[PDB]
Assembly symmetry: D2
Homo-oligomer: 36 residues x 4
């Protein structure tokens, strides 16, 4: 897989989860685009 | 403070969106700190 | 189709574009649930 | 103030809340730059 470091200085754990959910939204889109 | 995230398959523009979301959250917190 | 209004006061066209993109991602997630 | 209309077909209530939060983050950024 591929893992990247991000600077999340000052972000709360609730903020982190919002960032994680944004990553998942993008991955879900790519899982649809890859079908064709 | 540095976290790693799995970004498998994310394009270059996808990574940009993630970086911008992070920035938006930092600014909200600096804007809370300039209360 | 379902159309809703949002207060977007002070948002630039580029901020609006970011909102539209977020809506698009949310719709895709609902499609993906159907598989 | 300014409102705009968006097609949100299929979005759940919680989905709509995520959109509203993104708007508010964008508004806060502008309130900070000013
Ligand atoms: Cl991860």
């Amino acid at each position: 897989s591929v893992i990247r470091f991000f600077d999340v200085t000052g972000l709360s754990e609730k903020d982190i989860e919002r960032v994680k959910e944004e990553i998942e939204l993008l991955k879900i889109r790519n899982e649809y685009m890859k079908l064709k």
